[PDB]
Scaffold this active site. Structure first.
Site, PDB file in Angstrom:
ATOM      1  N   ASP A 209      -3.272 -33.527 -21.588  1.00 17.45           N
ATOM      2  CA  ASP A 209      -2.618 -33.496 -20.258  1.00 17.45           C
ATOM      3  C   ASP A 209      -3.475 -32.855 -19.165  1.00 17.45           C
ATOM      4  O   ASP A 209      -2.964 -32.538 -18.091  1.00 17.45           O
ATOM      5  CB  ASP A 209      -1.228 -32.852 -20.345  1.00 17.45           C
ATOM      6  CG  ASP A 209      -1.292 -31.455 -20.882  1.00 17.45           C
ATOM      7  OD1 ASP A 209      -2.417 -30.896 -20.864  1.00 17.45           O
ATOM      8  OD2 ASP A 209      -0.243 -30.921 -21.297  1.00 17.45           O
TER       9      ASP A 209
ATOM     10  N   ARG B  53      -3.954 -31.258 -13.932  1.00 16.35           N
ATOM     11  CA  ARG B  53      -2.867 -31.170 -14.892  1.00 16.35           C
ATOM     12  C   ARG B  53      -1.768 -32.218 -14.556  1.00 16.35           C
ATOM     13  O   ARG B  53      -1.329 -32.341 -13.412  1.00 16.35           O
ATOM     14  CB  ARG B  53      -2.310 -29.726 -14.859  1.00 16.35           C
ATOM     15  CG  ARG B  53      -1.120 -29.461 -15.782  1.00 16.35           C
ATOM     16  CD  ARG B  53      -1.483 -29.589 -17.269  1.00 16.35           C
ATOM     17  NE  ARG B  53      -0.474 -29.018 -18.183  1.00 16.35           N
ATOM     18  CZ  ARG B  53       0.643 -29.643 -18.558  1.00 16.35           C
ATOM     19  NH1 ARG B  53       0.901 -30.895 -18.116  1.00 16.35           N
ATOM     20  NH2 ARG B  53       1.485 -29.041 -19.423  1.00 16.35           N
TER      21      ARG B  53
HETATM   22  C1  LIG Z   1       2.687 -29.030 -15.401  1.00 15.44           C
HETATM   23  C2  LIG Z   1       2.675 -27.722 -14.641  1.00 15.44           C
HETATM   24  C3  LIG Z   1       2.221 -26.581 -15.260  1.00 15.44           C
HETATM   25  N1  LIG Z   1       2.221 -25.385 -14.578  1.00 15.44           N
HETATM   26  C4  LIG Z   1       1.825 -24.105 -15.207  1.00 15.44           C
HETATM   27  C5  LIG Z   1       3.122 -23.555 -15.852  1.00 15.44           C
HETATM   28  C6  LIG Z   1       2.640 -22.850 -17.149  1.00 15.44           C
HETATM   29  O1  LIG Z   1       2.398 -21.450 -16.818  1.00 15.44           O
HETATM   30  P1  LIG Z   1       1.837 -20.551 -18.033  1.00 15.44           P
HETATM   31  O2  LIG Z   1       0.275 -20.784 -18.269  1.00 15.44           O
HETATM   32  O3  LIG Z   1       2.043 -19.185 -17.519  1.00 15.44           O
HETATM   33  O4  LIG Z   1       2.587 -20.819 -19.418  1.00 15.44           O
HETATM   34  C7  LIG Z   1       1.349 -23.670 -17.480  1.00 15.44           C
HETATM   35  C8  LIG Z   1       1.466 -24.711 -18.612  1.00 15.44           C
HETATM   36  O5  LIG Z   1       0.276 -25.483 -18.463  1.00 15.44           O
HETATM   37  P2  LIG Z   1      -0.278 -25.951 -19.908  1.00 15.44           P
HETATM   38  O6  LIG Z   1       0.811 -26.810 -20.699  1.00 15.44           O
HETATM   39  O7  LIG Z   1      -1.485 -26.752 -19.578  1.00 15.44           O
HETATM   40  O8  LIG Z   1      -0.715 -24.676 -20.716  1.00 15.44           O
HETATM   41  O9  LIG Z   1       0.941 -24.383 -16.315  1.00 15.44           O
HETATM   42  C9  LIG Z   1       2.728 -25.335 -13.310  1.00 15.44           C
HETATM   43  O10 LIG Z   1       2.785 -24.251 -12.721  1.00 15.44           O
HETATM   44  N2  LIG Z   1       3.142 -26.436 -12.656  1.00 15.44           N
HETATM   45  C10 LIG Z   1       3.184 -27.621 -13.313  1.00 15.44           C
HETATM   46  O11 LIG Z   1       3.602 -28.571 -12.676  1.00 15.44           O
HETATM   47 CA   LIG Z   2      -0.301 -28.675 -23.051  1.00 10.72          CA
END
Ligand SMILES: Cc1cn([C@H]2C[C@H](OP(=O)(O)O)[C@@H](COP(=O)(O)O)O2)c(=O)[nH]c1=O
Ligand SMILES: [Ca+2]
Length: 129
Positions: A15, A29
């Protein structure tokens, strides 16, 4: 929403992807999804899927939603299309991602993806197996 050009710099995992956008390298992302990490179950398959999708594409587009365009890590948040096909939806449709991280005001394609998840789950595909 509108589709904008980009070119592949490199596949990363299920992703995330490194693309060139407005002439600058950016890690993207994928909105509204969560693939397993490379080390988790189906993590390798998710990564392979997105890689094949982006690397085979003659035309990559990015589509920002209505809300925030970069996350707290500086990753761009977009729907990514490969030759007109939405990778976010394709991962979910194949059971290689879950619908996840649905935040108010960046959720235009939420229902489209949930419909794909329902189909993937019905078919017991991959993560749903
Ligand atoms: C998809 C997405 C992830 N994120 C942040 C939330 C999560 O915070 P945390 O890192 O604190 O858990 C993290 C999950 O991304 P990943 O699934 O790539 O690790 O990315 C956003 O802020 N906005 C989004 O739209
Ligand atoms: Ca992931």
């Amino acid at each position: 929403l509108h589709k904008e050009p980009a070119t592949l710099i490199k596949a990363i995992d299920g992703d995330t992807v490194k693309l060139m956008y407005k002439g600058q390298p950016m890690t993207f992302r994928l909105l509204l999804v969560d693939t397993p990490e490379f080390n988790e179950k189906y993590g390798p398959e998710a990564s392979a899927f997105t890689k094949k999708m982006v690397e085979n594409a003659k035309k990559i587009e990015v589509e920002f939603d209505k809300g925030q365009r970069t996350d707290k890590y500086g990753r761009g948040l977009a729907y990514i299309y490969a030759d007109g096909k939405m990778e976010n939806e394709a991962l979910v449709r194949q059971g290689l991602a879950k619908v996840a991280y649905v935040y108010k005001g960046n959720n235009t394609h939420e229902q489209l993806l949930r419909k794909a998840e329902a189909q993937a789950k019905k078919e017991k595909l991959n993560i749903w197996s």
